[PDB]
Amino acid sequence: MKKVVAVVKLQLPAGKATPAPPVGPALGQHGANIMEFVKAFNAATANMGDAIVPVEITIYADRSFTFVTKTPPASYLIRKAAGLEKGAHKPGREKVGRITWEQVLEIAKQKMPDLNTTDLEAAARMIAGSARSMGVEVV
Amino acid sequence: MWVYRLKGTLEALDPILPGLFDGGARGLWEREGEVWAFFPAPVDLPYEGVWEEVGDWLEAWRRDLKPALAPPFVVLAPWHTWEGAEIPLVIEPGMATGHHETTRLALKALARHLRPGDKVLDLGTGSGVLAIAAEKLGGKALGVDIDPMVLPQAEANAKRNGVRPRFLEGSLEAALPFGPFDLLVANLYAELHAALAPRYREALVPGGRALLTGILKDRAPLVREAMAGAGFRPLEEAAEGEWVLLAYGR
């Protein structure tokens, strides 16, 4: 019972949001309070740090907003194991590091209420099948 | 500043995304089927998208700007004027101002707690608004910020207000040779307040007080636990919107 006119999807670094783009254009369009979001975003993500954080802004007809903070990218959390330099490229022909099958047994419960899976079973195979596009291994 | 447009979505290009924050990007944005990545400097990203210019959304703010009431003050832009009996605080708008709940809560709390002659520490000064407010109330104010870039505007703000706080680069430790203080005011995250609690007790004279804002309703327990743990006693809380102010005596 408050009309939504925008669900804006946006990836932002923890505690380092500013009026500047993407934020300016993304909220200014729908008359959302910009300074207000910057201040609220930053305080919300102050407990994490340097983490990339996906965030959904629900903008209403009165120009109100709420926002939901996400998990963040599976790929960020993978290379929290071996985060050496820049990642791979667009086709996929670059090396970085590696891991094994006991990272998922912690990080798939964190990344759970995103891509919906009630059973613990499939959660393994998605992270193992994400550790490929950057140059990662599982054995 | 240059935008970068990508062939997909935030969940179809989910593993090429870390490599973008190695490129220096500040933020990502999803469109009708496009990811727009913004940068302070352009480099050779391998994903073969397309680059665009700088270009609206800065001035919609600056020009709709109404004075912000926070009795006994009103915060005004250099181009406003005021009729009332409020104490005018003139603040060049930009790198933090007067219109946010947290600043208003802290300004009203200064008025309740500050005595003429008190030494004041304004932590994370930004614009210098609270250090300047304190001086208008007869306090002797030091404002510190870990970002030395804000300092010259804090000075310019102070000179348009006819006051002279001291402004320094640093945090608690840099303030220590200027203290101890009667009153500490700090607009900071809950997590920072909670980490700094012991050093807050160190910065204040016996019977001194801390006025703490920047705190989200839901994150206040963190601060309460930390402050009690550091030997402080609760004076009062004040709230507006999502935000609280917490006041303590040592």
UniProtKB/Swiss-Prot annotation, chain A:
Signal peptide: none annotated. One or more lysine residues are methylated. It holds the Pfam family Ribosomal_L11_N. GO terms for molecular function: large ribosomal subunit rRNA binding; structural constituent of ribosome. InterPro entries: Ribosomal_uL11, Ribosomal_uL11_bac-typ, Ribosomal_uL11_C, Ribosomal_uL11_C_sf, Ribosomal_uL11_CS, Ribosomal_uL11_N, Ribosomal_uL11_N_sf. Keywords: Methylation, Ribonucleoprotein, Ribosomal protein, RNA-binding, rRNA-binding. Gene3D superfamilies: Ribosomal protein L11, C-terminal domain, Ribosomal protein L11/L12, N-terminal domain. GO terms for biological process: translation. SMART domains: RL11. GO terms for cellular component: cytosolic large ribosomal subunit. PANTHER family: 60S RIBOSOMAL PROTEIN L12 (PTHR11661), LARGE RIBOSOMAL SUBUNIT PROTEIN UL11M (PTHR11661:SF1). Belongs to the universal ribosomal protein uL11 family. Part of the ribosomal stalk of the 50S ribosomal subunit. Interacts with L10 and the large rRNA to form the base of the stalk. L10 forms an elongated spine to which L12 dimers bind in a sequential fashion forming a multimeric L10(L12)X complex. Forms part of the ribosomal stalk which helps the ribosome interact with GTP-bound translation factors. This is Large ribosomal subunit protein uL11. The lineage of its organism: Bacteria, Thermotogati, Deinococcota, Deinococci, Thermales. The gene is rplK.
From Swiss-Prot, chain B:
Its main location: cytoplasm. Keywords: Cytoplasm, Methyltransferase, S-adenosyl-L-methionine, Transferase. Disulfide bonds: none annotated. Pfam families: PrmA. The keyword S-adenosyl-L-methionine applies. GO terms for biological process: methylation. SUPFAM superfamilies: S-adenosyl-L-methionine-dependent methyltransferases. It catalyses: L-lysyl-[protein] + 3 S-adenosyl-L-methionine = N(6),N(6),N(6)-trimethyl-L-lysyl-[protein] + 3 S-adenosyl-L-homocysteine + 3 H(+); an N-terminal L-alpha-aminoacyl-[protein] + 3 S-adenosyl-L-methionine = an N-terminal trimethyl-L-alpha-aminoacyl-[protein] + 3 S-adenosyl-L-homocysteine + 3 H(+). Its EC number is 2.1.1.-. Disruption phenotype: Mutant contains unmethylated protein L11. Null mutant is perfectly viable. It is found in: Cytoplasm. It comes from the Bacteria. InterPro entries: Ribosomal_L11_MeTrfase_PrmA, Ribosomal_PrmA_MeTrfase, SAM-dependent_MTases_sf. One of its GO terms (molecular function) is protein-lysine N-methyltransferase activity. GO terms for cellular component: cytoplasm. S-adenosyl-L-methionine binds at residues 103, 124, 145, 171, 187. Belongs to the methyltransferase superfamily. PrmA family. Methylates ribosomal protein L11. Preferentially recognizes free L11 before its incorporation into 50S subunits. This function is dispensable for growth and thermostability. Contains an N-terminal substrate recognition domain and a C-terminal methyltransferase domain, connected by a flexible linker. This is Ribosomal protein L11 methyltransferase. The gene is prmA.
